[PDB]
Amino acid sequence: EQLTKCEVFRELKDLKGYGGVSLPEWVCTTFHTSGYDTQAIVQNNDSTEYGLFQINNKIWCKDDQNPHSSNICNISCDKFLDDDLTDDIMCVKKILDKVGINYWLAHKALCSEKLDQWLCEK
């Protein structure tokens, strides 16, 4: 589904403060990672990134292109293409505990300033 700014804000609530990443940062970073599309798939050769968070199948989750992934998150990648972002968040929380916010490249380029464009009021 195609989510909006504030939908994302609501829905990423359990991520608020985890890793010292605020909700506004994540709204921005998700926007600039998947365009708020929960079914977004990016792939090459090679590797494929899945969902709101563009969680990859090289080390994070398993799929048919890389069934031999380390599968850190202990899950099928395609669980990251439905609307329940509960499992997506638990995996992002693991990406954060081991490689940090810079897995998401949009964070530093696009979401390191003008965080006022990413607020949801009331």
Residue 11 sits in the site that holds Ca ion (CB under 5 A): no
Residue 7 sits in the site that holds K ion (CB under 5 A): no
- Give 6 or 72: the residue with its C-beta nearer to K ion: 6
Instruction: Enter the tokens of residue 77.
Output: 């990648």
Interface residue with K ion, options 6, 18, 37, 41 (CB under 5 A) = 37
Interacting positions 43-82 with K ion (CB under 5 A): none
How many residues can be counted in the chain?
A: 122
Residue 35 sits in the site that holds K ion (CB under 5 A): yes
16 is in an annotated binding site: no
- Give 64 or 84: the residue with its C-beta nearer to Ca ion: 84
User: CA-to-CA distance for 22 and 2, rounded, in angstroms?
Assistant: 22
Stretch binding Ca ion (CB under 5 A), from 22-30, 55-63, 80-88, 106-114: 80-88
